[PDB]
Design a protein around this ligand. Structure first.
Ligand code: NA
Ligand code: NA
Length: 327
DNA sequence: CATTAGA
DNA sequence: TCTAATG
């Protein structure tokens, strides 16, 4: 956690570069597991060889360790750290939509700068373009202040279109969080569940409303169960506009809301934790259900869930408010 | 790990 | 279809 620090840091430093800059998913896979284990290891590693003793630690890695150990630096790393190519990739990859592969491509053709990326929107796709457009606005955290207002509006239409529609801004915001990255609204409906073959219209209706009122300025991807787009709070009695924000809304079959809802709220650890626990209490949890655990090693039969509460009660737990879902 | 775009 | 990019 701190003792095995730099090591893991350099490991993942190394890993990240393999998976993007190169297409070295193995090597990339290498660095990763290794840095995972040296990560749990309780003693101050003091020689590659030492570390070596580990599973995942091969020759190459250890060798680096030794180097990193000796000198507080890495060659491959400082050389890597300097290459404007790998650099350009690291950067380019930022744009929502620009992934490594697109990244390289862009680089080879020579788009290194954001400006470059401009003169050639032509070669960019819709996503990317928007992603390029709000390059600045997308990098920004959302003041809890705007969330409310954003949320307020969401909730107002969902309701305005169909009274039956249950909306639920999850995530960090919902966890109390002061700022968040983007807005994620969980959507469901009664007329919609596990069997009852779709009703695409469901998501579609509200997407339309959010557009009608001008909350939603642009679409990333609309699909029959998950909409990905771009929203904006009305720029008030002017002198001030709102930055564009990323919003996502997904339609959930009523029978599995809460499960998603729990999950979607997080934290990451909180889940695993509750999850790791559901297991001891003879259960199983995941993005949609909670199924009793059978001794024959496995079992199923997805248990009816009324709210986040029933989930706890099942696993026999203490209702922990969203604020306290920190872990 | 599953949904969408795109080509 | 397969591949990418988002989450
Ligand atoms: Na070994
Ligand atoms: Na991106």
């Amino acid at each position: 956690e701190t003792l095995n620090g730099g090591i893991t840091d350099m490991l993942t430093e190394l890993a990240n570069f393999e998976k993007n800059v190169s297409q070295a998913i193995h090597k990339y896979n290498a660095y990763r597991k290794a840095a995972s284990v040296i990560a749990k290891y309780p003693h101050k590693i003091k020689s590659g060889a030492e570390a070596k003793k580990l599973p995942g630690v091969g020759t190459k890695i250890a060798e680096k360790i030794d180097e990193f150990l000796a000198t507080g630096k890495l060659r491959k790393l400082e050389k890597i750290r300097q290459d404007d190519t790998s650099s350009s990739i690291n950067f380019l990859t930022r744009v929502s939509g620009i992934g490594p592969s697109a990244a390289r491509k862009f680089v080879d053709e020579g788009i290194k700068t954001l400006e470059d990326l401009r003169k050639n929107e032509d070669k960019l796709n819709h996503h990317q373009r928007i992603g390029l457009k709000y390059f600045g606005d997308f990098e920004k955290r959302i003041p809890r202040e705007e969330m409310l207002q954003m949320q307020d509006i969401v909730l107002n239409e969902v309701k305005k279109v169909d009274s039956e529609y249950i909306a639920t801004v999850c995530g960090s915001f919902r966890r109390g969080a002061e700022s968040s990255g983007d807005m994620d609204v969980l959507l469901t409906h009664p007329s919609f569940t596990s069997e009852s073959t779709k009703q695409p219209k469901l998501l579609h209706q509200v997407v339309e409303q959010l557009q009608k009122v001008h909350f939603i300025t642009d679409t990333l991807s609309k699909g029959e169960t998950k909409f990905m787009g771009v929203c904006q709070l009305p720029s008030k009695n002017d002198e001030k506009e709102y930055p564009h924000r990323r919003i996502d809304i997904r339609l959930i079959p009523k029978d599995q809301y809460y499960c998603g809802v729990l999950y979607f709220t997080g934290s990451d650890i909180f889940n695993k934790n509750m999850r790791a626990h559901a297991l001891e209490k003879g259960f199983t949890i995941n993005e949609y259900t909670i199924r009793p655990l059978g001794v024959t090693g496995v079992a199923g039969e997805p248990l009816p869930v009324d709210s986040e509460k029933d989930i706890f009660d099942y696993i026999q737990w203490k209702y922990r408010e969203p604020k306290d879902r920190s872990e």
